Amino acid sequence: EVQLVESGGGLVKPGGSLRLSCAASGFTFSSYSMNWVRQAPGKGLEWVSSISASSSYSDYADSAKGRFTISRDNAKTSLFLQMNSLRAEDTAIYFCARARATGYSSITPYFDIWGQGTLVTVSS
Template sequence: EGTVEAGGGRRGLRAPGESVLLSCRGSGFTFENHYVRWDRQAPGAGVEWVSWISHYSSQAQFGPALEGRATASRDNSRSEASLSLHLLHAGDCARYFCAVCTETRNQLSLNTN
């Protein structure tokens, strides 16, 4: 069974305008075969899609809340994906998740604080 593990980022406060880098690493499956998706959940709110990045980084898309303020990247040789958030503001306060869909169609997800 594949897994996705936390890495990067740290829990804590950020000042408005700062940036943060979130990352995750997959294991037990062929990472490069899968899109990586990022979602977030603010306190008391539902889950909101924020980004996805294609197999070989040729395409990335962002939700309206992060458009123009985020970059997504991945390093398939290390089975890692990253999401950089820039110009942070109070509305970005949330628990962030990354996920992939495996060959068995199970969604592997990670909560990144």
């Protein structure tokens, strides 16, 4: 099955660091852009960051700029998010999503496959 599996989410003290990992399986992972999306508990989804299919481009939300660093290993078929200076407001479920676009009208990507997400808690 086409599956994404996040891991590495846990409890972190504010100012701590964490590294989320999203193993990808069942698809030609090197073909697809990959994304991290998060959801503060009971809040809406927030996009966090994206990486191009060969890592040549990386994008971050204003909350993520400088604090996070997305990376991918196309040989390990694994997607990573380093996180630093975690604020209490960064407490959320983080999903990785496969991202896909049709260029016909515009390039807006959409998130066809999602992982079940890893809970990150940032608290004392």
